[PDB]
Amino acid sequence: METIEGVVVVGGGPVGLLTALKLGKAGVRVVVLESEPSPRAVAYMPPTAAALDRFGLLDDIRKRAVWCPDFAYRHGNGELIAKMDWAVLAQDTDYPYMLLLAQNHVSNVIVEHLRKLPNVEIRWNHKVEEIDQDDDYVTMETSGPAGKASLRAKWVAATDGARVRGKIGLTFDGITWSERLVATNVFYDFSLHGYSRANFVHDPVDWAVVVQLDKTGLWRVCYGEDPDISEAEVRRRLPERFKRLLPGAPTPDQYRVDYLNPYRVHQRCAAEFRRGRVILAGDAAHATNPMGGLGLSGGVLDAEHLAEALIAVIKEGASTKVLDEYSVDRRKVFLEFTSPTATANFTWMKESDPAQRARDNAMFDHAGKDLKVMREILLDFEKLNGRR
């Protein structure tokens, strides 16, 4: 059967592609098995931009991304609670901004860079059907357009989120399901009505995340809907909901809905990010609350650390303790920073007690006017880096 003296990466999303890119550039042989809420993880804060620059990708991403110099907290009526300006970090980082870009565009850029590396192969629409391992290799049964096949590798980097993760006997903890969310992609000129490129709308009923997807003018509007109703009824309800979720109370003729999908997500964190020769990153390892997690997925920095550790093993003789260190570092980032932050963001967002809301709004109002406090808050995102 087919043996890879190197790494098989499972999942062709950005996390998988990045891991491959950094492995590939170090001379490790890589095979990526790619297979398939359109589109999803979309915001890059400064530490992640710094990582993208280390991968050699940032210039190409910046050509296509929506440059986002600030983000806004807004009331349900659109009025500004606080605007958080990345320029307050101009002395602290070479990347004092956010970049917004749908995942498929990001993936396409990374795929361009991978094409220059003859030691990396991307296999399109190949899925892992079975996985087992022994002392020397991880053996997989795969299916692709050519039918079934067997493949083994020295190491597997699993990056896809669908229930590999659950074939190898790993325990996931902290599993919690979301409420019913609706993801819509909308052509509406939000910026003409005063919105920033990324907005968190705080309301007990009409809370939302409103963030630009690409340079076509397409925006993602994510909001809550009654969990009991049909998808047909969600669609029928949209026009009246958009009287509040879009600024300016537009009539239907002022916007075009390109896509609509109700969906639910589980949060979770694997108990350990490695089991023998299979190592988890990104969506295979963890997922944060969906509504407060903008820019906090940790996927890029997971990929960077994972590739570095695998390189040390494969090329530099290191003991597998570097892989244990990867697991401890990245799992700590999630449990200590990413998960609690995303959870607190969403709690604030949907707070329904009027007195608590008034206090929360006083806090945001302060953070938006005191630039030193604004700076401390925006610097917090550096915790995405962990201790590495």
Q: How many CB atoms lie within 10 A of CB 127?
A: 18
For residue 170, give the DSSP letter: P
Give the CA distances from residue 159 to residues 42, 86, 164, 338, 388, in Å, rounded to whole numbers and listed in that order. 17, 30, 9, 18, 20
Dist. CA 116–CA 63, nearest whole Å: 19
Q: Which residues pair with 3 in a beta bridge?
A: 152
Of the candidates 68, 285, 62, the one whose C-alpha atom is nearest the C-alpha of residue 171 is 285
Cis peptide before 39 (omega within 30 of 0): yes
- Terminal Cα distance for the chain, rounded: 38
Of the candidates 184, 182, 183, 186, the one whose C-alpha atom is nearest the C-alpha of residue 255 is 186
Q: Do the bridges between strand 120-123 and strand 138-144 make them parallel or antiparallel, or are there none, so unpaired?
A: unpaired
- Report whether 95 contacts 208 (CB < 8 A): no
For residue 159, give the DSSP letter: -
The H or E element containing residue 261 is: strand 256-263
Instruction: Write down how long the chain is.
Output: 388
Dist. CA 306–CA 295, nearest whole Å: 19
Amino acid symbol at 7: V
For 250, counting Cβ atoms within 10 Å of its Cβ (0-12 exposed, 13-18 middle, 19+ buried), the class is: middle
Amino acid symbol at 76: G
In this structure, what token pair is assigned to residue 173? 């903890």
DSSP 335-347: IIIIHHHHHHHHH
Way the structure was solved: X-ray
Residues of each annotated binding site: 15, 40, 128, 160, 283
* 3-class state of residue 158 by DSSP: strand
52: left (phi over 0), alpha (psi -120 to 50) or beta: alpha
Q: Which residue in this structure is represented by tokens 């087992």?
A: 132
- Angle at Cα 131 formed by Cα 125 and Cα 132, nearest 5°? 160
In this structure, what token pair is assigned to residue 241? 């909901």
- Angle at Cα 313 formed by Cα 311 and Cα 315, nearest 5°? 55
- Report whether 375 contacts 88 (CB < 8 A): yes
Dist. CA 154–CA 357, nearest whole Å: 53
Of the candidates 167, 172, 166, 170, the one whose C-alpha atom is nearest the C-alpha of residue 130 is 167
Residues of each annotated binding site for FAD: 15, 40, 128, 160, 283
Residues whose CB falls within 8 Å of the CB of residue 16, separated by 6 or more in sequence, listed in order: 9, 10, 32, 34, 157, 159, 160, 281, 282, 303
Of the candidates 112, 157, 149, the one whose C-alpha atom is nearest the C-alpha of residue 6 is 157
State whether the Cα torsion 295-297-300-302 is positive or negative: positive
Of the candidates 126, 165, 367, 183, the one whose C-alpha atom is nearest the C-alpha of residue 286 is 165
- Report whether 212 contacts 105 (CB < 8 A): no
Give the CA distances from residue 195 to residues 75, 190, 246, 355, in Å, rounded to whole numbers and listed in that order. 12, 5, 10, 26
Longest dimension (CA), the chain: 66
Chain-centre distance for alpha carbon 372: 28
Side-chain-side CA neighbours of 271 within 13 Å: the count stands at 8
Task: Compute φ and ψ for 224, nearest 5 degrees.
Answer: -100, 145
- Report whether 140 contacts 152 (CB < 8 A): yes
Dist. CA 163–CA 148, nearest whole Å: 20
DSSP 50-117: HHHHHTT-HHHHHHHSEEESEEEEEETTS-EEEEEEGGGGTTT-S--SEEE--HHHHHHHHHHHHTT-
Give the CA distances from residue 380 to residues 89, 193, 291, 341, 373, in Å, rounded to whole numbers and listed in that order. 11, 30, 19, 10, 11
User: Exposure pattern of 350-377 as b/e (b: 16+ CB <10 Å)?
Assistant: bbeeeeebeebbeebeebbeeeeebbeb
Of the candidates 249, 54, 36, the one whose C-alpha atom is nearest the C-alpha of residue 161 is 36
* 3-class state of residue 1 by DSSP: coil
Dist. CA 287–CA 63, nearest whole Å: 28
Q: How many CB atoms lie within 10 A of CB 210?
A: 26
Q: Do the bridges between strand 43-44 and strand 98-100 make them parallel or antiparallel, or are there none, so unpaired?
A: antiparallel
The resolution of the experimental structure, rounded to one decimal in Å, is: 2.0
Q: How many CB atoms lie within 10 A of CB 280?
A: 31
Q: How many CB atoms lie within 10 A of CB 117?
A: 17
